């Protein structure tokens, strides 16, 4: 009766459509993505085609209704993220950005003109987007951003000056969703396009996490943005923070995919690998580790399902997402690390993949809110007292 | 939108009946049990009346259909356990025994005569029962039990000899469900009654955990048991192990009640207690602890709900129960310990209750399968390889 | 070559005198203290005689030179604390107070008259002292104390008003060293004596930690203190904090005694206790725990030795003591908890002693600076930035 | 008085020579090694010159007396390892191999001819050596090695067949110390030299740990070894295990260097980096982490000193080394991981170095005995019962 691959029977909680979506995508991930990841991660190569392929599959911005989007459930989105990360976090990162940080904001805060113009191309993967929020001196604290947008009443345009750093996709992006503080004090979102004079996106080197993902900066040297390129629905941090919650939800699901991959790899290895005349799996010390991995993965999976259902009922609060994002990323990191220890020397070889996941989850536990920041977010909600600053 | 008392909205997952049952019982627990626990735990006093009271409420053996039992869902049973333990583990222990270790076996493995005869009295709390499995040299390993039952073909009866130890309720029990190895090699269950010649149940002293619970031994000096007092439905360890899973399920839910109590107490204390001119809740170190407690409690609550639903569909496997029992008891223990540290000096006073829960959860994490035994149970299920012995 | 009872050979680091002192005291502790601890802890009984006995042995205020004191090394003091706590923390607490919190301050900040008058009696155990610093609203933050001392220029005396709580020895104390804020803003130390009008010391009930220790309050209802009873060498928090470091040093050593006791008990139990046809010690899960316990104990022992040597050279800084106090108390707590889990059901019985140590170490990790406060103390020293307040 | 860079004043425990040695080497490491590590690690480049340079400095095989070796203390050796690893584990690995796994065995188990012939060249870095013990199917269990050596009575030589894997330095080694099982059942050590027919040493690719170190295999296709190339002092596992303890001792010290580097980097970063209008160092959550790092580093440093002193007195047992190797490597890993989390996004860049140490320590915690194997080694010593196998 017990199936270690699905202890609490998540399967019977999914709809036929969700199950169908998951399996279909899984096939694509295993057939087209797994075979390119080894060298991609080793030589820091991101295949632009990947976005086009996922575009044809209609996986980009799946929860969006209309504009060429699937219009599927939040749970389906979570299931998609899990299958992508089961392969690699870098790949899932590229998809999170396109879906939740680029398409979503244009959909929720954009004008109908902007939706009509960008969504269809983004959905089909014709345009690669990026989300510019973080800056050299503004990470956990967005109120410290220095990127400014000055209004030109005569030209009915804005002039942007600033630097965004650690931006996923920027080096090969076509559309840039940038957040800058305005003269009125409010921070707004601007749509920039490659080619605009004064806009640069150099690549960041020396990464030892999310190597199969393109990461760069966004340097704006007096970039002039037409008024029509401004997002009319966002005013102050609420716009970005809102988008952030959608990306974080996808992340809470995704890391479970990476964990499951690590669990499966460690398990099979423990059964195949022999020392002292028996398989490693025969040892108590080894079995306890496997039990811990399965336990944490399971608790996170069913919690994510619940959040996904609440989300579709418009009953999901940002704190809920922080709770699972923080929990799953932290737990996922520990799992990948244990798995690495379990494969011994072979574990430091990327040929065995676990080392790649352990490295990748390092970055995942940091971006979209650090583990400690999310704790403080929960702390504020629990006590009603803010403790970020002094 | 966010309610820290129910982060993922468990409430909307419960039926009106379940909610009604929970609240009704909660009222009883807060009005009748909380007021007696301070001194009960301090002076090791178990109020026999408690079983009668719960009997009138019809909370005893709630999942049983007929025989004067409520016939409620597994989730309802879990909800009941949670409210009882929110008060004290010792109290919930007395109820777990009566319901899952005494009534359940008589219901599933007993003859119709035994059901008709015992269930109604047990349901109303007229009879206090106990479950005798563990022995001085047989704890984590039941195959080592030395209690033997010899058959008397002439009298059509059995003669039992042995010692059961660390038995909840034994000192004031009326009915004893004892497990002994038979001459044929199979271990069977026998129903003994206070008064039988050769049967003794002395109390155990020096307990510093579950003090409000009566704990003793069961000494059998050639006790003669009529054949009709044997449970015809059990043959070898499967009978007790089966019952054990039902008790463990209730335990997985219960410890969450104790955790929630500790969380609420620590939280309120952090808000009321002031040092350095501000409430303790203002400190980052304090807020992280609260965030961790809420996180673990939440993951366990929704996992338990899922298990409860599967259980009512007859799709629950023993491994599922081990996973949650091990997880929730371990996590609950850490939570009570953190809470104790958070109340400082006052935390070692039973007047603040947290110290009582921390002590109680010590025993809970040990009985009904130790934390490590459950890991091995999961390990066997995951690898297909047994690692209990060498 | 390897001796698990002393992995890094601490023995060859001790002087013949230190070794002699340790063994002599050990004999007393095992012969006179161990036999009374079971019931003492169970019924909350502190034997006043214990202080007289240690007085005859000359163990009280051992580092003090003259006044009938041994005048031994700091390491000897640490060794003494370790042997006392190997028996019980409550007992070591009574000795820490007498030696470091009562005798030391009178020795360092007192007038020659006060030394001549009190030290000899305290050294011989004729007088039982206590240290009154903590108050209901002043624990981790001493600047919040409300006990005030008003000067009476005419009578050349002070009038004290306030309440000290959670004070070790107060219910049966003869001498009270109380700290109160003065009209000039500075906090001074006053010597009070039982019998003074307005002075009350009721006992605290409901303790589930350090039960063999007498703990009470110090209520001062307009107590008049002669000027000669004021400690001329202390002015503001430096006096108490200075004394505190001496007590904390003894604590860092002591908890290692309790840990060693828990390690030895768990080890022997694992060898004697059999399940699954072999001793528990045969299991990998069990052996890892023992390895962890030995490792932490060893690291702490040699660190304490080093601190002790520096101390005698007047090169010990308060931060050094915080580091070891915080480390050893935290680690000791984990060790006792693991040991308790290792003895299973029997572990919750005080007959097996481990449960007593686990409970006791709860209080030890809280008093003389909480685990988190000491972290902040280290944090300030490392960064040069204070983070206690906001 | 308190200096966070040396809490317990290790400095006053070192001799003038040891201090002189440390500082002299430190200068070399910071001036010649630090500047090459960034790209070395990034592009997997090991500079052969490094061994020549350390050879001129006389740091190779420092504890050896004569043969052109320094003949310094064990503590000096530890101090050297700490300064090397403060730069990079890969670099220290190359030195550990040359000193403890190549020079030491030739010194202790070799013939005078072999010493005269190899030591002088190894000491000056003229020859690069490697230690071949591990095989594809023989890691934690050496008794499973398949490399065999057949004796040729006629030629008075041996023929070796087998494969060694994960061997540090092999791809550019001149001398190979290989261990093979003989026909008599005993395993002996053979000295091979590059150029011998049938000997191959291909490089291993895909490493994501110790990248600045050359790692390869040793394939022996019927390699013929003269009798004079056999180590006359080793017979069965004792030879390699003996050498292993010397390398492990150096490792226990070394990882503390990497930890200190991570602590210093995280600390400075916390002081320079600002968010929410204050330096990160102002936050409680940040300060606790720093306190933990300093605590563990300190406990390990003084324990290592003690072991080093015992070693020079020939009183060091293998278990002592396991205890510190296991402890320091495990703790060092946690420290590097925390530091990485503390630098946020920048932490995944090798430009900030912490990510390199975290990756490197992964391998260090695995080789020379895994964390769990060392636990079992301690477990056997503590209980007298072996638990490696079943
Ligand atoms: C691979 C990768 C891809 C990324 N892609 C994008 C992208 O597409 N778009 C984008 O906008 N950003 C992106 N980012 C950046 C991510 O959003 C930011 O890295 C994160 O928000 C940045 O904070 P920080 O790195 O400056 O960390 P900081 O937090 O400033 O500093 C690091 C440490 O400080 C701690 N800390 C901070 N404040 C406090 C406090 N008040 N109390 C206690 N502890 C505190 C943190 O928890 C952490 O441990 C990416 C980052 C990475 C690594
Ligand atoms: C308050 C209380 C009430 C109880 N009430 C009842 C009752 O009503 N009815 C009843 O039948 N029993 C009862 N029990 C007993 C409980 O069921 C048993 O205590 C538990 O099953 C007993 O095992 P043990 O205590 O002997 O532990 P043991 O496991 O024998 O030993 C303790 C340690 O050994 C470890 N260990 C054991 N085997 C292995 C292995 N193969 N590998 C690795 N580690 C191992 C355990 O995990 C544990 O840490 C009660 C116990 C308590 C404390
Ligand atoms: C058995 C026993 C015997 C004692 N004997 C004596 C005695 O003889 N003499 C005496 O003077 N005292 C004595 N004490 C009291 C001890 O000195 C005090 O209990 C301790 O200093 C009191 O602080 P608190 O209990 O109020 O804790 P509080 O710290 O006020 O509150 C508890 C929690 O708040 C946390 N906290 C507090 N401030 C901060 C902050 N700024 N940031 C983050 N976290 C914070 C603490 O770390 C802790 O977890 C005794 C206590 C006990 C339990
Ligand atoms: C960078 C690097 C450099 C190296 N350089 C050298 C060198 O120069 N010379 C050399 O000889 N070797 C070298 N090695 C290899 C090192 O000595 C071996 O990797 C280690 O001994 C190999 O064991 P394994 O990798 O097969 O692990 P295995 O232990 O076989 O398997 C991995 C896991 O199994 C666990 N495990 C194994 N047995 C048990 C048991 N009985 N009970 C419970 N758990 C168990 C381990 O603890 C571990 O977590 C190097 C390795 C690396 C990564």
Residues A164 and A270 in one domain: no
* CA–CA distance, A64 with A59 (Å, rounded to integer): 10
Angle, CA of D243, D245 and D246, to the nearest 5° = 70
Task: Return the closest-CA partner of residue D234 out of D114, D146, D65, D154.
Answer: D114
Q: Is C113 helix (H, G, I), strand (E, B) or coil?
A: helix
Contacts of D348 in chain A (CB under 8 A): 207-210, 362-363, 366
- What's C377's domain CATH number? 1.20.140.10
Task: Answer yes or no: do D285 and B284 touch at CB < 8 A.
Answer: yes
Residues A178 and A296 in one domain: no
Rounded to the nearest angstrom, the distance between the alpha carbon of A37 and the centre of ligand 1 is: 26
To the query of whether residue B368 is one of the catalytic residues in this protein, the response is yes
- What's C196's domain CATH number? 2.40.110.10
Q: How many CB atoms lie under 10 A from the CB of residue D192?
A: 24
* Contact (Cβ atoms closer than 8 angstroms) between residue B185 and residue B227: no
- How far off is chain D from A359, nearest CA to CA, in Å? 8
Residues B116 and B145 in one domain: no
* CA–CA distance, C288 with C310 (Å, rounded to integer): 34
* CA–CA distance, B34 with B46 (Å, rounded to integer): 13
* CA–CA distance, A354 with A270 (Å, rounded to integer): 14
Pairing verdict, β A175-182 and A129-132? parallel
State the DSSP code for B110. S
Nearest ligand to the CA of D347 is: 1
**Domain edge (last residue) among B82, B99, B128:** B128
Pairing verdict, β D157-168 and D148-152? antiparallel
Residues D22 and D106 in one domain: yes
Q: How many CB atoms lie under 10 A from the CB of residue B75?
A: 24
Q: How many CB atoms lie under 10 A from the CB of residue D204?
A: 18
* Contact (Cβ atoms closer than 8 angstroms) between residue D220 and residue D51: no
CB within 8 Å of D172: residues ≥ 6 apart: D46, D48, D128, D214
| Residue D167 Cβ < 6 Å to ligand 4 | yes
CB within 8 Å of A319: residues ≥ 6 apart: A377, A378, A381, B2, B4, B7
Rounded to the nearest angstrom, the distance between the alpha carbon of C133 and the centre of ligand 3 is: 11
Task: Answer yes or no: do C276 and B208 touch at CB < 8 A.
Answer: no
* CA–CA distance, C185 with C44 (Å, rounded to integer): 39
* CA–CA distance, D374 with D387 (Å, rounded to integer): 12
The ligand 2 site (C-beta within 6 Å) comprises B 97, 130-134, 139-140, 166-168, 210, 215, 363, 366-367, 370, 372-373, 388; C 275-276, 280, 283, 285-286, 341-342, 344-345, 348
Nearest ligand to the CA of B216 is: 2
* Contact (Cβ atoms closer than 8 angstroms) between residue B252 and residue B325: yes
Q: Domain range holding B271?
A: 236-390
Q: How far is CA D147 from the centre of its chain?
A: 24
Angle, CA of A376, A381 and A384, to the nearest 5° = 100
Whats the size of chain A, residue-wise? 390
- Give me the total of CB pairs closer than 8 Å, taking one residue from chain B and one from chain C: 120
Task: Return the closest-CA partner of residue C366 out of B271, B361, B283, B348.
Answer: B348
* CA–CA distance, B203 with B222 (Å, rounded to integer): 20
* CA–CA distance, C361 with C246 (Å, rounded to integer): 19
If residue B147 lies in a helix (H) or strand (E), which one and from where to where? none
Rounded to the nearest angstrom, the distance between the alpha carbon of B104 and the centre of ligand 2 is: 22
Atom of ligand 1 nearest to the CA of D342: 49
Sign of CA pseudo-dihedral D276, D278, D282, D287: positive
Q: How many CB atoms lie under 10 A from the CB of residue A65?
A: 10
Residues B95 and B190 in one domain: no
Rounded to the nearest angstrom, the distance between the alpha carbon of C352 and the centre of ligand 2 is: 15
Q: Is A91 helix (H, G, I), strand (E, B) or coil?
A: helix
* Contact (Cβ atoms closer than 8 angstroms) between residue D143 and residue D237: yes
Task: Return the closest-CA partner of residue D311 out of C8, C335, A330.
Answer: C8
* CA–CA distance, A110 with A130 (Å, rounded to integer): 16
Is A242 annotated in a binding site? The answer is: yes
Q: How many domains does chain B have?
A: 3
If residue C390 lies in a helix (H) or strand (E), which one and from where to where? none
Q: How many CB atoms lie under 10 A from the CB of residue B387?
A: 22
Atom of ligand 3 nearest to the CA of B276: 41
CB within 8 Å of A361: residues ≥ 6 apart: A89, A255, A258, A329, A332, A333, A336
Pairing verdict, β C148-152 and C175-182? parallel
**Domain edge (last residue) among B128, B154, B179:** B128
The CA-based dihedral angle spanning residues C138, C143, C149, C153, taken in that order and rounded to the nearest 10 degrees: 180
Residues A159 and A212 in one domain: yes
3-state helix, strand, coil in chain B (%, to 5): 55, 15, 30
Residues B211 and B357 in one domain: no
* CA–CA distance, D219 with B155 (Å, rounded to integer): 78
Residues A143 and A120 in one domain: no
Task: Answer yes or no: do D341 and A141 touch at CB < 8 A.
Answer: no
* CA–CA distance, C138 with C164 (Å, rounded to integer): 9
CB within 8 Å of C53: residues ≥ 6 apart: C28, C32, C125
Which residues share a beta bridge with C203?
C216
Quick one: residue B184, left, alpha or beta (phi over 0 = left, psi -120 to 50 = alpha)? alpha
Closest to A208 (Cβ–Cβ): which among D137, D166, D348?
Answer: D348
If residue A332 lies in a helix (H) or strand (E), which one and from where to where? helix A318-342
* CA–CA distance, A179 with A122 (Å, rounded to integer): 19
Q: How many CB atoms lie under 10 A from the CB of residue D137?
A: 14
Q: Is A207 helix (H, G, I), strand (E, B) or coil?
A: strand
* CA–CA distance, C148 with C161 (Å, rounded to integer): 6
Q: How far from D308 is each of A231, C138, D301, CA to CA, in Å? A: 66, 46, 10
Whats the size of chain C, residue-wise? 390
* Contact (Cβ atoms closer than 8 angstroms) between residue D302 and residue C306: yes
**In a 10 Å sphere around its CB, with 0-12 CB exposed, 13-18 middle and 19+ buried, how is residue C268 labelled?**
exposed
Residues D286 and D205 in one domain: no
If residue A275 lies in a helix (H) or strand (E), which one and from where to where? strand A274-275
Angle, CA of B127, B129 and B130, to the nearest 5° = 165
Helix axes B318-342, B354-364, angle to 10 degrees: 150
Task: Return the closest-CA partner of residue C280 out of C338, C337, C343.
Answer: C343
Residues A123 and A133 in one domain: no
Helix axes D284-312, C318-342, angle to 10 degrees: 80
* Contact (Cβ atoms closer than 8 angstroms) between residue A106 and residue A152: no
* CA–CA distance, D157 with D151 (Å, rounded to integer): 6
Instruction: Name the closest residue on chain B to residue C210, using Cα atoms.
Output: B348
State the DSSP code for B99. I
* Contact (Cβ atoms closer than 8 angstroms) between residue C180 and residue C145: yes
End-to-end Cα separation, chain B, in angstroms: 54
Which residues share a beta bridge with D167?
D216
Contacts of A288 in chain C (CB under 8 A): 285
Q: Is C170 helix (H, G, I), strand (E, B) or coil?
A: helix
Report the residue among C97, C140, C180 best suited for mutation to probe ligand 3: largest number of ligand atoms under 8 A from its CB. Answer: C140
- Give me the total of CB pairs closer than 8 Å, taking one residue from chain A and one from chain D: 120
**Domain edge (last residue) among C81, C103, C128:** C128
State the DSSP code for C204. P
**Can you list the pairs that A368-372 forms with residues at least 24 positions away whose Cβ atoms lie under 8 Å?**
A368/A244, A368/A247, A368/A248, A368/A251, A368/A325, A369/A140, A369/A244, A369/A248, A369/A322, A369/A325, A369/A326, A370/A140, A370/D341, A370/D344, A371/A326, A371/A329, A371/A330, A371/D341, A372/B288, A372/D285
If residue B261 lies in a helix (H) or strand (E), which one and from where to where? helix B238-272
Closest to D387 (Cβ–Cβ): which among C283, C303, C379?
Answer: C283
Sign of CA pseudo-dihedral D137, D138, D140, D143: positive
Residues C70 and C189 in one domain: no
Residues C243 and C389 in one domain: yes
């Amino acid at each position: 009766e017990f199936d270690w691959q699905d202890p609490l029977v998540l399967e019977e909680q999914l709809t036929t459509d969700e199950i169908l979506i998951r399996d279909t995508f899984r096939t694509y991930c295993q057939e087209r993505l797994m075979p390119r990841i080894l060298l991609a991660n080793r030589n820091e190569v991101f295949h632009r085609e990947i976005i086009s392929e996922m575009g044809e599959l209609g996986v980009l911005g799946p929860t969006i209704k209309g504009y060429g989007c699937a219009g599927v459930s939040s749970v389906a989105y979570g299931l998609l993220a899990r299958e992508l990360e089961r392969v690699d976090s870098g790949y899932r990162s590229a998809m999170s950005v396109q879906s939740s940080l680029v398409m979503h904001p244009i959909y929720a805060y954009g004008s109908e003109e902007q939706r009509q113009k960008y969504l269809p191309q983004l959905a089909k993967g014709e345009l690669l987007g990026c989300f510019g929020l973080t800056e050299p001196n503004s990470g956990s604290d967005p109120s410290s951003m220095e990127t400014r947008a000055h209004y030109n009443s005569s030209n009915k345009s804005y002039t942007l000056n600033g630097t965004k750093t650690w931006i996923t996709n920027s080096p090969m992006a076509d559309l840039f969703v940038v957040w800058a503080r305005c003269e009125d004090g409010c921070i707004r979102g601007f749509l920039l396009e490659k080619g605009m004079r004064g806009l640069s996106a150099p690549r960041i080197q020396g990464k030892f996490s999310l190597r199969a993902s393109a990461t760069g900066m966004i340097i704006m040297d007096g970039v002039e943005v037409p008024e029509e390129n401004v997002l009319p629905g966002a005013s102050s941090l609420g716009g970005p923070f809102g988008c952030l919650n959608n990306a974080r939800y996808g992340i809470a699901w995704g890391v479970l995919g990476a964990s499951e991959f690590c669990l499966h790899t460690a398990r099979q290895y423990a059964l195949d690998r022999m020392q002292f005349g028996v398989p490693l799996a025969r040892n108590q010390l080894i079995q306890k580790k496997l039990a811990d991995m399965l336990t944490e993965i399971t608790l996170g999976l069913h919690a994510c399902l619940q959040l996904g259902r609440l989300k579709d009922q418009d009953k999901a609060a940002p704190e809920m997402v922080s709770l699972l994002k923080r929990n799953n990323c932290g737990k996922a990191l520990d799992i990948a690390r244990q798995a690495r220890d379990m494969l011994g020397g072979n574990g430091i070889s990327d040929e065995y993949h676990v080392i790649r996941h352990a490295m990748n989850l390092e970055a995942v536990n940091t971006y979209e809110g650090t583990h400690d920041i999310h704790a403080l977010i929960l702390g504020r909600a629990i006590t009603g007292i803010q403790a970020f600053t002094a």
